[PDB]
Each structure stands twice: as C-alpha cells, then as structure tokens.
Amino acid sequence: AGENLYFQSLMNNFGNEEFDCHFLDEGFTAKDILDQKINEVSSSDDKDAFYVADLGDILKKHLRWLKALPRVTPFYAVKCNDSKAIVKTLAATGTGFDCASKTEIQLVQSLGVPPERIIYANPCKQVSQIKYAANNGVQMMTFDSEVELMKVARAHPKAKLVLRIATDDSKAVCRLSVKFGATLRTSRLLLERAKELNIDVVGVSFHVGSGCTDPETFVQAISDARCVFDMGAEVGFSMYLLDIGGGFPGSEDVKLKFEEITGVINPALDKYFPSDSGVRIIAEPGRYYVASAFTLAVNIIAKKIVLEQTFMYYVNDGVYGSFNCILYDHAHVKPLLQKRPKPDEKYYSSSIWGPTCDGLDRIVERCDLPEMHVGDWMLFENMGAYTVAAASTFNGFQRPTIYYVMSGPAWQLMQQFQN
Amino acid sequence: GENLYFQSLMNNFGNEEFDCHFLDEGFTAKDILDQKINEVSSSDDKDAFYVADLGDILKKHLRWLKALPRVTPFYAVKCNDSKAIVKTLAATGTGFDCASKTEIQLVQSLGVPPERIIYANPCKQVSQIKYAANNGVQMMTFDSEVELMKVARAHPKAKLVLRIATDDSKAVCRLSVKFGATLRTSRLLLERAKELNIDVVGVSFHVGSGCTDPETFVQAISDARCVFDMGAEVGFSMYLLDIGGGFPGSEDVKLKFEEITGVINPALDKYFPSDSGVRIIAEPGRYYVASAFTLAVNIIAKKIVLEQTFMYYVNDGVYGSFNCILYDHAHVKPLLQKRPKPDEKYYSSSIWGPTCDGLDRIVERCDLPEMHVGDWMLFENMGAYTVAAASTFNGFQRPTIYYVMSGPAWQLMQQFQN
Numbered sequence: 001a002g003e004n005l006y007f008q009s010l011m012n013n014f015g016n017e018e019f020d021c022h023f024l025d026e027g028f029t030a031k032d033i034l035d036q037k038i039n040e041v042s043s044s045d046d047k048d049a050f051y052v053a054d055l056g057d058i059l060k061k062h063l064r065w066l067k068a069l070p071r072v073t074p075f076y077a078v079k080c081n082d083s084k085a086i087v088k089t090l091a092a093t094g095t096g097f098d099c100a101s102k103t104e105i106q107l108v109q110s111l112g113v114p115p116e117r118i119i120y121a122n123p124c125k126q127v128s129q130i131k132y133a134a135n136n137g138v139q140m141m142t143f144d145s146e147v148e149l150m151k152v153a154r155a156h157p158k159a160k161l162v163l164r165i166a167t168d169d170s171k172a173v174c175r176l177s178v179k180f181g182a183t184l185r186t187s188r189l190l191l192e193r194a195k196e197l198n199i200d201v202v203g204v205s206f207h208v209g210s211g212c213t214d215p216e217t218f219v220q221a222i223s224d225a226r227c228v229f230d231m232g233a234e235v236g237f238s239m240y241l242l243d244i245g246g247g248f249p250g251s252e253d254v255k256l257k258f259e260e261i262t263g264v265i266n267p268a269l270d271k272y273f274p275s276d277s278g279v280r281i282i283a284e285p286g287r288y289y290v291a292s293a294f295t296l297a298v299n300i301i302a303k304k305i306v307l308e309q310t311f312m313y314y315v316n317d318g319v320y321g322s323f324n325c326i327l328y329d330h331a332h333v334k335p336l337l338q339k340r341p342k343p344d345e346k347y348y349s350s351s352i353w354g355p356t357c358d359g360l361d362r363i364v365e366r367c368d369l370p371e372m373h374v375g376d377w378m379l380f381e382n383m384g385a386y387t388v389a390a391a392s393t394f395n396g397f398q399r400p401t402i403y404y405v406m407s408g409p410a411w412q413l414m415q416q417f418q419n
Numbered sequence: 420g421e422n423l424y425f426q427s428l429m430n431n432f433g434n435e436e437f438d439c440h441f442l443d444e445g446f447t448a449k450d451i452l453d454q455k456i457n458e459v460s461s462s463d464d465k466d467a468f469y470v471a472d473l474g475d476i477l478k479k480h481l482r483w484l485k486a487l488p489r490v491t492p493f494y495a496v497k498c499n500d501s502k503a504i505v506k507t508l509a510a511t512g513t514g515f516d517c518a519s520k521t522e523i524q525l526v527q528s529l530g531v532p533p534e535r536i537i538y539a540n541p542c543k544q545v546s547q548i549k550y551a552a553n554n555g556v557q558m559m560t561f562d563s564e565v566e567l568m569k570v571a572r573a574h575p576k577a578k579l580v581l582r583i584a585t586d587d588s589k590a591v592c593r594l595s596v597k598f599g600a601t602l603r604t605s606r607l608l609l610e611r612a613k614e615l616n617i618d619v620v621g622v623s624f625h626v627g628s629g630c631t632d633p634e635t636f637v638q639a640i641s642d643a644r645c646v647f648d649m650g651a652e653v654g655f656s657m658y659l660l661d662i663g664g665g666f667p668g669s670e671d672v673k674l675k676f677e678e679i680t681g682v683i684n685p686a687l688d689k690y691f692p693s694d695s696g697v698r699i700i701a702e703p704g705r706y707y708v709a710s711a712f713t714l715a716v717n718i719i720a721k722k723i724v725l726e727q728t729f730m731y732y733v734n735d736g737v738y739g740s741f742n743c744i745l746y747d748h749a750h751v752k753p754l755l756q757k758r759p760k761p762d763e764k765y766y767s768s769s770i771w772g773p774t775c776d777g778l779d780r781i782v783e784r785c786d787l788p789e790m791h792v793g794d795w796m797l798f799e800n801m802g803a804y805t806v807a808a809a810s811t812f813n814g815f816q817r818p819t820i821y822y823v824m825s826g827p828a829w830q831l832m833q834q835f836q837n
C-alpha cells in the first residue's frame with residue numbers, strides 16, 4: 001500500500017517520462033496486467049495492438065545466466081530488441097552490450113554505460129562509424145577480413161580486435177556463416193597481417209547461428225577458437241578474450257533448452273580455456289534475454305466466412321510490423337485465445353491476416369479456432385526477439401505501444417546487481 | 420537570376436520538412452547524384468542517400484492524363500508516403516488512396532479536401548473508420564458482410580465502393596487471396612447493404628501489383644459491369660468505377676504502361692461509355708514514383724574468396740530499402756556510378772547489406788569490375804515499396820532523400836494547379 005506507492009514512485013523515476021513501468025503487486029503477473037488492460041477497453045473502440053513487457057522476466061534470465069554459465073560475462077545483443085527500457089534494465093543489472101552500429105553505441109553510452117562494457121561486434125563496419133567508436137572510447141571491435149584491418153589501421157589504430165571465425169551453423173534456424181566468420185586458414189593470414197600493420201588482436205569470437213539446434217557446434221567452435229589463440233601466440237599476440245556469441249533459446253517452448261546447451265558448453269570451456277589460462281570469456285546473447293518477456297495482444301479488426309465453414313480473421317499487427325519475424329527470423333507463431341474457450345464448442349479451420357493491403361501479409365495460413373468476432377483479442381507469447389526491432393510503418397500502421405511491468409522482488413534484485 | 424527565383428520558390432515549398440533543390444540549365448537528377456558523390460570524395464561521410472526527381476513524378480502525371488483521359492488518378496500513398504511526393508501530387512490535383520488514419524492525416528495536413536480521398540482499405544479497424552467519419556472522409560471500400568455491419572454502426576452515411584476479386588494469378592504481387600468479393604458474394608453484399616440502408620456507389624478492383632497480363636483489366640472491368648447491373652437491379656444508383664493499380668513504374672519492364680492503357684481504354688468505352696453517367700478513377704502507386712528515386716549506396720567492406728570472386732558489403736540492405744526484394748519480389752540491378760575501363764576485367768560478385776544477418780544479401784551473383792571500399796553503386800527505379808517499408812534493424816538509419824526539380828517541372832505543376 002505505502003510500500004506499493006513507494007515502488008511505483010521509483011519505477012516512475014526509472015521510466016523517466018520515456019517509458020511506462022507499472023508496479024506488479026504480490027500475486028499479480030504480467031498476464032494479469034494484460035487481461036486488465038483489455039478489460040479496461042472492453043466497452044470502447046480504442047483497441048490498438050499493444051505489448052506487455054515483463055522487466056522481471058529479463059532479471060530472471062540474468063540470474064539464470066549467472067548460474068548456468070558462471071565463467072561467461074553476457075554482453076546483450078542490442079539489435080535483438082533495442083527498446084530503451086530493456087537496455088536500461090540490463091545496464092543497471094551490469095551486463096555488457098554488443099553494439100552493431102553508431103546509434104546502438106549512442107543508446108548504450110546515453111544510459112551511462114562505460115566503453116569497456118561495449119563490444120562493437122559488427123565485423124564489417126562503415127569507416128565513419130569506426131571513427132565514431134574511436135572518438136568515443138570504444139576500443140573492442142570484431143573483424144574477419146584483411147580489408148577490415150586496413151580500415152582499422154587508418155581509422156582506429158589503437159583498437160583491440162577480436163577475430164571472428166567460421167562455425168557449423170548448417171542446422172541453425174538463422175545461418176550467419178555465409179556472411180561472417182574467417183576460416184582457420186584465413187585466420188592465420190589475418191593474424192600475420194594484423195601483426196605487420198601493428199594492430200592488436202586480443203581474442204576470438206564466433207556465432208553458431210541464431211536458433212542453434214546442435215549444441216556440439218559450440219564444442220567445435222571453442223576447439224577452433226583455441227587453434228586461433230595458439231596461432232596468435234606463435235605470431236606474437238597475447239590472446240585473452242573469448243567471445244562465444246549467441247544462439248541460445250529465449251523461451252522453454254523449444255526442443256533444445258538453454259541448460260542443455262550450457263551443459264555442453266561448460267566442459268568445452270574447461271578443456272580448451274581453463275581459468276588458469278587467464279582467458280576472459282564473454283558471450284553476445286540476444287534472444288535469450290528478451291523473447292519470453294514480451295507478449296503481444298492484437299485485436300480482431302475484420303472477419304470473413306468462407307464456405308466446411310472456415311474463417312479469415314484480420315488483426316491490427318502484421319508481417320510489416322511485429323510479425324516480420326515470420327519472414328526474417330523464420331518464426332513459427334502460435335495464436336492464443338485471450339478469452340478461454342468453451343470446453344464443448346466447435347473449432348473451425350481459420351487463417352489470420354495482418355492489417356495491410358498486401359496478400360503477403362498473412363500471419364497464420366491455417367489453424368483451428370473457435371468462432372471469433374471483431375473486437376476479440378488474440379495473444380502471441382515469446383514475441384520479444386527480432387520483432388519490434390525490425391518493424392516498419394507500411395500502410396501507415398504505427399508500432400504497438402509497449403507497457404512495461406516489474407514486481408517488487410524484481411526491482412529489489414536489480415538493485416542487488418547494481419553494486 | 421532565374422536560379423534565384425526558382426530556388427526561392429523551392430525553399431519555401433520544402434520549408435523545414437524537406438529539401439527541394441533546383442535543377443539548373445540542362446542539369447539532370449543523375450548529375451546531382453554525381454555532384455553529391457564528388458563533394459564527399461575526400462571524406463568518410465558516405466552514408467547511402469537518395470536523389471528523388473519530383474519532375475519525374477510531374478511527367479508521370481502529364482503522361483497519365485494523356486494515356487487515360489477518362490480516369491482520375493488517386494495516388495496510393497502507401498507505395499511511398501514521403502511528404503514531398505504527396506505535396507507535389509496534391510498541388511497537381513490528384514486524389515489520394517489512403518490505407519489508414521495516419522495516411523488520411525498526412526493528406527489532410529496538406530490541405531486536400533476529403534472528396535479527393537478514398538479510404539481504399541476493405542478491412543478497417545472500427546476506431547479508424549470513426550476517424551474517417553469524424554473528418555469528413557465519406558468514400559470507403561469493402562468486400563464482406565462484417566464490414567457492412569461495422570459501417571452501419573460507425574459511419575452510417577458512408578459512400579461505399581464494393582471491391583471485387585480479380586484473376587491476379589500472373590501478377591507479381593497477388594492480392595485476391597486476401598481481398599475482393601466473388602460475383603455471388605457481391606450480390607449478397609448489395610442486398611445486405613440495401614437492407615441496412617447503406618449507400619453503395621460503385622465497384623473497385625485491383626488486378627495485382629506488377630500486372631503481367633493486360634487482359635486481366637478487361638475481365639475485371641467486365642466483372643465490375645456485372646456488379647453495377649446487380650446494383651441497379653437491387654435499387655442503387657451506382658456511378659463510381661475504380662480500376663485500382665498494378666501499372667509499372669519504369670520502362671525497364673516487359674509490359675509497359677501504354678500497352679496496358681491501350682487495352683483498358685476500349686474496355687472502359689465498351690462497358691462504361693461516357694453516356695452511362697460513370698465516374699472512373701484508379702489507385703496507382705508504383706506508376707508515379709518508381710523511376711523518380713535512385714539509391715546511391717557505398718561499398719563499406721570487402722572480401723576476396725578464391726578465379727577470384729568478391730563479396731561487397733553496402734550501407735543499405737534487406738531490412739532497409741531492399742526489403743523490396745522480400746516483400747515486393749523486386750529484381751534489383753546494381754549499376755556502376757563510374758564508367759569502367761574498356762578492357763578491364765569482371766569478377767563474379769555478391770552484394771550484401773550492412774546488418775548481422777546472413778539473410779541480408781542484396782545480390783547473390785553478378786559480374787562487376789573489382790571494386791574498392793569507398794566506391795558507390797547505384798540502384799535506379801527504387802521509389803516504390805522501398806522507403807515505405809524500411810526498418811532500423813541493427814540501428815541503421817534510413818538514407819536521407821534529396822529532392823530535385825527543374826524550372827520547367829515547377830511550371831508544369833503550376834499549370835496543373837489551375
């Protein structure tokens with residue numbers, strides 16, 4: 001009561017008139033807040049799509065990371081979801097940040113995060129953006145090419161470079177190795193070339209692919225990273241930074257859970273990078289931190305019946321907005337009823353469509369649903385990763401508002417981390 | 420002296436919203452592009468940028484008036500919602516096809532009366548229907564019984580335009596899977612609207628974006644006539660024919676604008692002669708804007724893969740302007756910005772966007788001379804379904820658009836405006 005208004009006051013300060021962070025009472029969840037917001041507009045037409053984002057879920061992910069990967073410092077991949085509230089939460093918690101560009105560096109530096117908690121993990125950077133990093137004290141960057149070394153020699157000669165190597169991402173949902181990652185053969189030449197140019201290489205990074213499905217690829221990558229460390233020693237570098245990238249799942253609704261992956265990572269780290277080697281192990285998790293924290297509520301705005309009886313439902317977010325993940329992230333979205341269905345009632349073959357002009361704007365091709373009506377809500381859980389970060393305003397449709405929530409214990413845990 | 424007059428006009432035209440640069444004495448939009456590149460040749464300030472020729476848009480309008488004299492164009496704002504484009508076409512006297520509240524707001528903010536707006540989204544959020552009603556926008560499209568019920572409640576005096584299905588099997592972007600009533604449904608919709616005291620004033624269709632077969636317009640027009648006859652039978656006084664979009668936006672196409680218009684015009688005269696009282700409109704998007712925009716991107720990074728092949732990374736990509744590759748089935752064509760040496764050697768090359776994603780590849784395979792970091796590549800015909808669907812994934816910002824317009828182009832716009 002007095003306690004609740006105290007926490008809310010502090011969450012209002014945290015929000016800083018940039019985002020709304022709503023205090024979660026004892027016994028109330030992010031799911032309850034979603035229901036409450038829906039009930040509040042029940043007799044209204046003000047039924048725009050919206051998210052509820054549980055900042056407490058993000059804190060739980062951090063705790064869980066600390067336990068599962070105790071030797072590995074997480075640097076959050078800003079690109080996955082660049083919402084300021086998320087970055088601010090993680091900044092207070094004490095994570096590092098993997099930044100892809102100048103604007104992400106600017107976001108992170110604006111929240112008071114020191115340059116040593118940033119890795120500029122884009123291997124192929126525009127020179128003007130390299131200069132920006134140099135001018136703002138961001139020293140650590142990745143690379144995987146000889147041209148990148150030539151650019152760094154000119155624009156950031158004192159940078160600490162991290163050589164990104166190829167992985168076997170053949171079974172990963174999102175493959176990155178076609179685009180980034182030097183082969184071991186190329187790595188050797190890059191090390192020698194860096195040495196000639198008087199550039200300091202301090203370590204190795206890799207990414208096994210977003211949505212990893214074969215955890216052994218982490219073992220192969222760690223083994224390969226050791227080979228490059230060894231080659232660096234031969235050419236004259238003191239290597240101390242191992243960056244194991246991302247690829248971790250962001251919810252429990254997956255075949256390969258986080259803990260299964262960390263269970264194979266840890267023994268490989270102990271074998272190839274024992275703590276008495278002096279190695280600092282980092283990672284660049286994105287999806288892991290944020291996926292389950294966001295739930296999206298969309299409203300059914302239009303409806304058609306196609307004759308057994310089948311239905312087409314149109315909702316107010318789509319493939320040009322949050323559901324761009326269907327195309328770019330190969331996401332398989334699962335529509336959830338906001339109103340619990342009657343135990344007995346008929347289900348029909350149904351399709352779900354976005355709000356735009358485009359026939360390509362289809363969210364679900366075929367599913368079974370009870371008969372729904374205009375004004376009913378549908379829910380999409382685990383919508384935090386590679387969603388709002390890649391949304392457009394095609395057709396003029398604005399991005400759903402994100403309403404943040406946080407419990408007392410979550411707030412307290414964040415303060416614990418912040419010292 | 421003439422430079423000072425026209426640039427004063429154009430400074431005020433752009434205001435503090437956009438930059439509109441005067442094209443002098445036989446200077447083209449291509450020349451300005453080259454000029455801007457030359458200005459930064461000694462620096463590292465090489466962000467991707469657009470040059471957009473508002474005079475090209477004005478030429479499209481003049482061309483439309485000549486090719487389809489019976490058809491009032493309502494620009495499809497969604498194709499490219501840049502304010503400068505809408506302001507240019509607004510002065511010209513086009514109508515506007517608005518998809519949502521935000522687009523209606525944009526058009527009304529430029530002084531366009533609601534009778535020059537069609538809300539051509541068949542499946543509209545109720546609150547946005549109410550927005551249109553509250554702001555005097557009467558004409559809206561529909562294709563379902565639930566839409567009629569929504570209109571009865573939220574916009575009872577609306578003038579409705581029944582959208583029908585088309586054979587878009589061969590169009591680049593198919594729309595009839597999502598929108599357009601069958602003939603059987605159309606009859607039921609008219610009967611239902613009569614019983615709900617809703618006024619249905621006409622029929623619309625869309626043959627699909629990137630039309631490949633012009634005869635689709637003929638069948639759609641004959642289908643629209645069938646629905647007009649249904650309407651007369653139930654007691655409506657239908658007058659509005661809306662032939663949608665699907666026209667090409669450049670000459671770099673198999674099926675050119677005049678070939679399509681050449682089959683449309685006889686169909687219109689056959690099925691909707693001027694003595695019928697019909698008013699004919701269309702909803703072109705791509706047609707007005709595609710060729711007007713050229714994108715210049717910089718090669719920001721480079722790899723050699725062993726004959727030698729090359730991978731070039733540029734500072735716009737699939738999450739940005741080149742989203743058109745995924746959403747618009749665009750076939751983009753990289754162009755050199757400097758003429759190569761006549762003998763010099765070409766390599767198999769790929770072109771990649773600036774983001775983390777392996778999916779962010781613009782050109783899988785093309786032949787190019789050996790390029791270097793700092794060199795520019797050009798992409799013409801980049802005005803349609805590009806900037807309008809770009810995101811800031813990885814934090815990369817949208818390229819700024821530099822507008823240009825000639826003196827003769829300004830004068831043309833004046834000639835249209837009164």
Ligand SMILES: Cc1ncc(COP(=O)(O)O)c(C=O)c1O
Nearest residue numbers: 077210246247284285286287775
């Ligand atoms: C270099 C880099 N680091 C981190 C990530 C985040 O990966 P994930 O979200 O799968 O953890 C990515 C995303 O593709 C990446 O390319």
Ligand SMILES: Cc1ncc(COP(=O)(O)O)c(C=O)c1O
Nearest residue numbers: 357495628664665702703704705
């Ligand atoms: C209803 C409607 N009108 C107009 C257009 C613009 O089409 P285009 O750019 O092919 O002329 C579209 C695009 O899909 C549309 O759906």
